[PDB]
Scaffold this active site. Structure first.
Site, PDB file in Angstrom:
ATOM      1  N   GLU A 136      14.675  49.636  42.574  1.00 27.17           N
ATOM      2  CA  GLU A 136      13.699  50.733  42.505  1.00 27.17           C
ATOM      3  C   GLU A 136      13.615  51.565  43.789  1.00 27.17           C
ATOM      4  OE1 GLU A 136      10.228  48.591  41.204  1.00 27.17           O
ATOM      5  OE2 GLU A 136      11.057  48.358  39.181  1.00 27.17           O
ATOM      6  N   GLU A 140      15.218  44.453  34.823  1.00 24.33           N
ATOM      7  CA  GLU A 140      13.828  43.992  34.716  1.00 24.33           C
ATOM      8  C   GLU A 140      13.168  44.560  33.462  1.00 24.33           C
ATOM      9  OE1 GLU A 140      11.185  44.624  38.019  1.00 24.33           O
ATOM     10  OE2 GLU A 140      12.605  43.914  39.554  1.00 24.33           O
TER      11      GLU A 140
END
Ligand SMILES: [Mg+2]
Length: 340
Positions: free
Chosen positions: A149, A271
């Site tokens: 991220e 994820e």
């Protein structure tokens, strides 16, 4: 042809994240970082338990920042590197598929300011050069995921794929990552390397600006906790799953097929998951719709598990690590038996 990457990924049933563990940022330059967010030290038995339940792939998130020496070498503290290797080895001992990443670097040095491209690329490369060397002799079941991220925390578009300038920076950083690893040679010459979008975001403009390396041994990672209002707790969130919101999943997945899958680019969801809201039956149904959507094209996912279930916090916990028992066998069943 990127078929070798597809072949490797096809061996995965479904994956599991060792969350809030080596990615934890307390403890300073110490192996105690691992337990700093309240999780027990990882053991061979914990990893065995994940594998035995049917998660034959494990993602091992690691935050390196506090364990790094000064620029420009950014030397990883020897104790930390050894401990990271111990944990990866638990999985290798069990013949598992593995993702090793860098993780909350975003709290520290990995701030996506396009004007700082050189320093960013160089630090990422310096870290990955060391990791690639340490794991050079590991087989094709161990994959590297360059960043997690990557974004500018606090920015307006932090969680919406950032800005166009930031997305070009991400492309440059993905290349630096691949370049640094391939340069170490050995098994790293063709190891699967997992690049990402800005913030692991999968919105159309984010996918549209993603550069695809010519390197044939890569995959693109995304995080799709979709729908956000089902999986997370927020004003506007809900715990009921009756299918009415499946469209949110389908729409997003169609953009992934458009830009990646249908172009023959391997995609991995590194994820996803749904926080537990005393809604077992609803999560079980969501898993069917969500994982079933990925199964249409054999896309694999890794479930986020931070070992939080009864206590305060984001309740993504699935394995009670202290007891080696699962918090919720119905949710876990739906995951591991997704292909049934
Ligand atoms: Mg070789």
């Amino acid at each position: 042809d990127r078929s070798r990457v597809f072949d490797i990924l096809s061996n995965i049933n479904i994956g599991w994240n060792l969350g809030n563990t080596l990615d934890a940022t307390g403890g300073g330059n110490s192996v105690n970082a691992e337990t700093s967010w309240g999780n027990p030290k990882t053991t061979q038995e914990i990893v065995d338990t994940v594998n035995d339940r049917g998660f034959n792939a494990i993602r091992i998130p690691v935050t390196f920042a506090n364990h790094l020496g000064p620029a420009p070498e950014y030397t990883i503290s020897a104790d930390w590197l050894a401990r990271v290797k111990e944990v990866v080895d638990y999985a290798v001992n069990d013949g598992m598929y593995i993702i090793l990443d860098t993780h909350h670097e975003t709290n520290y040095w990995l701030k996506t300011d396009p004007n700082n491209e050189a320093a960013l690329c160089e630090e990422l490369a310096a870290i990955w050069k060391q990791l690639a060397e340490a794991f050079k002799d590991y087989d094709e079941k161990l994959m590297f995921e360059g960043m997690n991220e990557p974004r500018m925390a606090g920015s307006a578009k932090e969680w919406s794929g950032g800005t166009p300038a930031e997305r070009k920076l991400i492309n440059a950083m993905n290349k630096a990552f691949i370049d640094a690893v391939r340069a170490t040679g050995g098994n790293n010459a063709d190891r699967v390397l997992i690049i990402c979008t800005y913030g692991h975001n999968s919105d159309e403009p984010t996918l549209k600006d993603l550069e695809i390396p010519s390197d044939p041994n890569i995959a693109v990672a995304l995080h799709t906790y979709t729908p956000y209002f089902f999986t997370y707790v927020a004003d506007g969130s809900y715990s009921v799953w009756n299918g009415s919101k499946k469209n949110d999943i389908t729409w997003q997945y169609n953009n992934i097929k458009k830009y990646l899958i249908d172009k023959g680019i391997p995609v991995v969801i590194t994820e996803t998951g749904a926080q537990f809201k005393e809604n077992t039956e609803d999560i079980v149904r969501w898993i069917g719709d969500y994982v079933g959507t990925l199964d249409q094209d054999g896309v694999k996912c890794f479930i986020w598990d931070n070992n939080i279930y009864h206590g305060n916090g984001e309740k993504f916990g699935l394995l009670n690590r202290s007891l080696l028992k699962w918090y919720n066998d119905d949710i876990v069943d739906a995951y591991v038996n997704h292909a049934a």
